[PDB]
A paper describes a structure:
As a part of our ongoing programme focused on host-pathogen interactions at the molecular level, we identified a lectin in the P. asymbiotica genome designated PHL, which we prepared in a fully functional recombinant form. The lectin PHL interacts selectively, mainly with l-fucose and oligosaccharides containing terminal l-fucose residue, and prefers an α-glycosidic bond over a β-linkage. The PHL lectin forms a seven-bladed β-propeller assembling into a homo-dimer. Both units contain two types of binding sites situated between the blades and have different amino acid compositions and binding preferences.
As mixing PHL with the branched compounds leads to protein precipitation and thus prevents co-crystallization, the direct study of complexes was not possible. Therefore, we soaked the PHL crystals with monomeric fucoside 2, 3 and 4, respectively. Crystal structures confirmed that all the studied fucosides were able to bind the lectin PHL. In each complex, the electron density was clear enough to determine the position of the fucosyl part of the compounds in 6 out of 7 fucose-binding sites of at least one PHL monomer unit – A or B, while site 2 is occupied by Met60 of the neighbouring monomer, as was observed previously. The second saccharide unit was clearly assigned for all three fucosides 2–4 in sites 1 and 3. Considering fucosides 2–4, the position of the bridging methylene group is close to the α-Me-Fuc O1 atom, which is not directly coordinated by the protein in the complex. The O4 of the d-arabino-hexopyranosyl unit in fucoside 2 and 4 is coordinated by a glycine backbone nitrogen in sites 1, 3, 5, and 6, while the O6 atom of fucoside 3 is linked to a tryptophan backbone oxygen in sites 4 and 6. When comparing the overall orientation of the second hexopyranosyl unit of fucosides 2–4, it is similar to the galactose unit of blood group H trisaccharide, with minor distortions in individual binding sites influenced e.g. by crystal packing. The remaining parts of fucosides 2 and 3 were not resolved in the electron density, suggesting their negligible importance for ligand binding. The second saccharide unit of studied fucosides was only marginally coordinated by PHL binding sites what, together with affinity comparable to monosaccharides, suggests a low importance of this type of compounds for inhibitor design.
Author numbering:
A (entry chain B): 26 to 369
B (entry chain A): 24 to 256, 259 to 369
Write the structure that this text describes.
Amino acid sequence: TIALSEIVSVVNTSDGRLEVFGVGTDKAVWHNRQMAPHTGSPWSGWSSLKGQVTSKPVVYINTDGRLEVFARGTDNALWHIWQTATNAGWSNWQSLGGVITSNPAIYANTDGRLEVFARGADNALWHISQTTAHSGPWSSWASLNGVITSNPTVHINSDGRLEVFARGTDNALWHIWQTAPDSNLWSSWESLNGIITSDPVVIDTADGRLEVFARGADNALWHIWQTISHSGPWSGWQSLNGVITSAPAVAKNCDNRLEAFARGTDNALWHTWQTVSHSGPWSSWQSLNGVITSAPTAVRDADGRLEVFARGTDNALWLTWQTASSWSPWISLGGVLIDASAIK
Amino acid sequence: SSTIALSEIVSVVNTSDGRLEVFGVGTDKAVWHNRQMAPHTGSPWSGWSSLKGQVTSKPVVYINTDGRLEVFARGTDNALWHIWQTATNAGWSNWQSLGGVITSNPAIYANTDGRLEVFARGADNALWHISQTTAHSGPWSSWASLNGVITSNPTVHINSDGRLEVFARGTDNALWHIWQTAPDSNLWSSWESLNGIITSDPVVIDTADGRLEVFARGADNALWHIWQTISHSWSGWQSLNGVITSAPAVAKNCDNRLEAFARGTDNALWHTWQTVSHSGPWSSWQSLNGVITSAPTAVRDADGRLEVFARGTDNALWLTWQTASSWSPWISLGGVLIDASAIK
Ligand SMILES: C[C@@H]1O[C@@H](C[C@@H]2C[C@H](O)O[C@H](CO)[C@H]2O)[C@@H](O)[C@H](O)[C@@H]1O
Ligand SMILES: C[C@@H]1O[C@@H](C[C@@H]2C[C@H](O)O[C@H](CO)[C@H]2O)[C@@H](O)[C@H](O)[C@@H]1O
Ligand SMILES: C[C@@H]1O[C@@H](C[C@@H]2C[C@H](O)O[C@H](CO)[C@H]2O)[C@@H](O)[C@H](O)[C@@H]1O
Ligand SMILES: C[C@@H]1O[C@@H](C[C@@H]2C[C@H](O)O[C@H](CO)[C@H]2O)[C@@H](O)[C@H](O)[C@@H]1O
Ligand SMILES: C[C@@H]1O[C@@H](C[C@@H]2C[C@H](O)O[C@H](CO)[C@H]2O)[C@@H](O)[C@H](O)[C@@H]1O
Ligand SMILES: [Cl-]
Ligand code: NA
Ligand code: NA
């Protein structure tokens, strides 16, 4: 078990449009993009990329701008589909083999090779990668060992080393990392302790330190960080308080101030934000209303505003965004979305 | 034309850990640098320290995809020389020669595969270039030519689809450009003219909506600009007025609104900015005071605030930044800087 997941994967595209990906009642991947690179732009509407997926689909922007969606398939292998060019159509769904047991986690190495991390049948962390930048063919799968109990999350350090996080068998946050950029040489697994009851959410701060967010045993929102840019030692666990009934989402305001979002005990969107600057103390929790049935997903848009997405009581994706003063009334992008996360 | 508007005095970069760090040439012809202590507006500065060398161009810093800074400059023997941090944000190597014979300041960008590629004018007046053979690493490739005959320092930027594109003034004084036909490629297009008459180095940026847009001073000494019509497509040349006595400097506010800077006829800092949003109209020119003896250098710091550097009447480097309402008063970072620009 883990706190209620995010219903969609979202990306700010190379032309500054938000674009959201989720699973339909039919088990296919569907997407929705902004027309215009602005807060409040009209949306395309939901359209199908087809496939039949058995995990959350996860979008990533290749270093040449082209989106690529990863999702577990009906055969439990990793499959993908990618734009043929930045403002063009899509490929056919294609298989990368393997047998996996979590949602895929994706990051681009410093050399532009996308690297995919996913849980195995053995419950280890496995990985596979592009052989050259933003392009097939891909490597063979190999394992990074471990025994993990959540979906993994990956983020690049400010020195180019990929680093992967997942819950362990003791329910602590565990991590593993590249010892050199673009490398196949990884550390051992190391515990960062704690007790976590959601997927980790990982952020690179403005000052170059990995910060992990997670729900605790008390259902508060807790966070732990690197104390030095791309380096240990780590901090201790620190509570941001709150009582949250979903997974948290975290993103950066345009001034780099972190801002955490989560479903509350009342099923509204609540948030807490850094005050003053990117190294300032956190607000108290405040409500952004609505009644939501997934964790929120947050993203900064091409106007430097945070937009937050969440499923509604009618199973459609709803949207609220920052304004000069406040936030905008909930609006509906329509659709009917399922939670297809491969671990719940 | 054998002249261009007064060049920038330093080259600025956002460090891997989010600090501003400027590089210039002292009276001994060595490359010197200064950085902020902490990544906030109005942080104290380290003071100037020497990386030695003897340079006959402006030194141009670029950040590798692993976070290590690397400084490029023409040497006393007209070869391209370089010096790099041997570990992200830590110590520096010795200067080494990349050979070649060049006649401009060097222009640098990362390919989508992490390989830096350096462009500069040759002895034969054509555009030459060289690159790292693997991501953020030597050895370097052979020098090669993209032909052309150019009369300004070249400017390189990457398209929103990963193709590098280089801009330089031609022998008819028009803006000319030439581009990669694929990312990471040695395949380029032919040279093409964007017409106009330019009296400065071109300055190039990527808009939030993924368009290359080039600013340059014109024949009437106004700031002009031109752009790609669609992401990685040009428009006509449009004037932004002013009478400017230096090269311009463009940077993005945290909401992505462009803002241009340049020295006035009264030798003060002037600015004009996009209003409302990043597709908004351009304000009229306003003074930021000060008396400057170079073109300004503009950059967004980790507080989402714009900071502008310019040499002063005393030859020190001076600084003013955006506040909540206005701009801070000009302050001196000291040092004694010269214009070592290979083309003036
Ligand atoms: C994600 C994948 O979706 C499907 C791939 C299908 C493969 C076929 O060439 O095109 C279809 C749509 O026209 C795809 O949907 C499944 O068959 C596969 O097993 C897996 O679940
Ligand atoms: C993620 C972690 O994986 C395992 C760590 C193991 C720790 C040991 O030093 O090396 C093994 C393989 O070389 C790891 O698999 C679990 O024992 C641990 O409790 C936790 O779940
Ligand atoms: C996210 C929020 O966290 C909770 C706790 C918050 C706990 C903190 O110590 O004080 C705040 C102000 O009194 C509370 O709002 C709930 O009150 C609320 O229903 C929601 O779940
Ligand atoms: C940029 C370079 O700077 C100098 C490099 C020097 C190379 C020497 O071995 O060590 C010195 C450090 O104290 C450097 O300054 C010039 O000799 C060279 O010709 C070139 O102009
Ligand atoms: C940048 C441009 O370089 C030259 C373009 C030339 C155009 C010609 O047809 O092909 C040559 C070989 O590649 C180019 O060198 C100049 O003649 C032009 O005036 C301008 O300065
Ligand atoms: Cl001088
Ligand atoms: Na969501
Ligand atoms: Na490239």
